[PDB]
Amino acid sequence: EFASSFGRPQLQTLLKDALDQKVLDQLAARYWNRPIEDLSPAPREPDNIIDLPKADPDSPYWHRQLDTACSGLTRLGVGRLAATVAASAIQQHVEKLLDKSSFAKHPSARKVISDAAATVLADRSYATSDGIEISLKPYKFDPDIQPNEWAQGREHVVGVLQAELEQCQAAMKALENSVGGRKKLKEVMSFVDKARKGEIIVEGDHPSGAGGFSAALLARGREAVFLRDRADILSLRIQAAKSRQCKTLTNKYYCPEVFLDAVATKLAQTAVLFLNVEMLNDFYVRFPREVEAKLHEHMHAGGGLEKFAREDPKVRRHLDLIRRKELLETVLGKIEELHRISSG
């Protein structure tokens, strides 16, 4: 039943999710803000994300940034990532099926089944990964994006980015309610902003009390400022992804979000086809044979058939009960025969 259920679009969503987080990582590490650790003035980096829509189109910084971002995304082990993701997914489905199956007891037999699935997937893993990298070799060189793919990436980026924003804002508001009033966290935020500017100094590597704020309160204020800046950047990039300037494909360096999402979807789908063939069919064919062979060999080699019987308390007493009755019957038969051979 499960094998009839699984198929290939499930693998597509599975890969597209791992690659979605890969996109967020690459994009965030190349474009967005870095954390606040101390209370010293940070020198403002020359190029900033707020001035990206209004930037010189032939900017070596933004060009190099989006280019190293994409090359970093493509020259990753996408073959091995797809292979291991599909592997963990298939194995997990087998483990759940095992949970609902009759092998909830007998953890040895259960482990034999699980290890059978694991060894099959492990056997096929390399061929799937290498084949996926070879099949992706043309899209590593030129992941040329068609206007329709660009639109798809456009619609996906809005959702991915806003989900990242909602996680950020919910964490901010919970921080407010934890520290106390929104206004009080606004006070510690104003203090950390002041110390981040020249307005006030603290001279502390680990400041305990400054302006009347505790050591924990300072940490909560820095955390609040980082969350704020990341929220503003996120909303700004959402507005940019919904902007009219990102609707067209010609502004690829101006819209890194949409471009990186398009590359992710493409790589996911072409990798997914080879993955389903090379790996999924191989699992459906090898798995039943491996289960039967390993279970029989386990029972007879390890003597775990007798333990399989001993394990369930009900069948234990059953297999025990029969012989004692047989012995008493044979005893009575012997006495009854004794009386017949000797009348008295």
């Binding site: 020259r75 990753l76 082990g77 073959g79 990298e133 070799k137 590593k140």
Partner: protein, 50 residues
Amino acid sequence: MSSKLNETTEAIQRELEETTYQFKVQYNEQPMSAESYLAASLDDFKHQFH
């Protein structure tokens, strides 16, 4: 040393495997020498000059 020799040998074979893998995924196994780089760049410059 002789005892550790076998395990070290197998591990060396493996890291030779991984170095080859990085050579496959990141540079597509393109052979490279200094002379090849210089000649290619010189021809690029000559095309620009033409």
